[PDB]
Amino acid sequence: SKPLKGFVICCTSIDLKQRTEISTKATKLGAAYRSDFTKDVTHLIAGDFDTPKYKFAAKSRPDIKIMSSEWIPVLYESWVQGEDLDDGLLVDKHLLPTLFKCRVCLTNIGQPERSRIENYVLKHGGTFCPDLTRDVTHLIAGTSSGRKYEYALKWKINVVCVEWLWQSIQRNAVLEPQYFQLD
């Protein structure tokens, strides 16, 4: 029984302990493992969007499935427990949310735009942040002015136009901020 025949798996933003567990179980399941992001990679297991590997997959590898860290351990346990593994291999259930680990704040944006943006952020696995804090990942700004904008620059927080959100959603992955800079 080799369920994951044809699968080539790579990890990013995963701790060594879980990474070893993943590589071990994935190999048992019949998959190939890669330390480097090579061409034959089919599945990227990610714990963050803010890595060279994730960014590469986002801009150049639309064919690659971005997976959550819990995919392999769950699939492996189901295998061992004698459960019948259906065609799909729990991939769809364990696809990483598009805005995983994104913490989105807004400025210079009115209603009902503000309400609609929050709607799509929550729907796609992100966190909405009414006030700006240092752990905010993206500030969506209508204009380049005001207290939030200035603190965003000072703290080196991504400042993007709303198109960042729409195209990240379309792509099913977080896109890099410079493509959506304010003019």
The contact set with Cl ion (CB under 5 A) reads: 11-12, 14, 34-37, 97-98, 105-106, 124-125, 130, 163, 166, 170-171
Pick 29 or 102: Cβ nearer Cl ion: 102
Specify the long-range contacts of residues 125-133, CB closer than 8 Å, at least 24 apart. Answer: 125/96, 125/97, 125/98, 125/99, 125/100, 126/97, 126/98, 126/99, 126/100, 126/102, 127/102, 127/103, 128/104, 129/103, 129/104, 129/105, 130/105, 131/105, 132/105, 132/107, 132/157, 133/105
- Residue-wise over 138-150: b if at least 16 C-beta within 10 A, else e? bbbbbeeeeebbe
φ, ψ for residue 95, nearest 5 deg: -65, 135
Smallest gap from residue 80 Cβ to Cl ion (A)? 25
Pick 29 or 165: Cβ nearer Cl ion: 165
Smallest gap from residue 87 Cβ to Cl ion (A)? 22
Pick 59 or 83: Cβ nearer Cl ion: 59
Pick 112 or 130: Cβ nearer Cl ion: 130
Smallest gap from residue 78 Cβ to Cl ion (A)? 23
Residue of 146, 171, 144 lying closest to 59 (CA atoms):
171
Smallest gap from residue 98 Cβ to Cl ion (A)? 4
Smallest gap from residue 85 Cβ to Cl ion (A)? 24
Pick 46 or 79: Cβ nearer Cl ion: 46
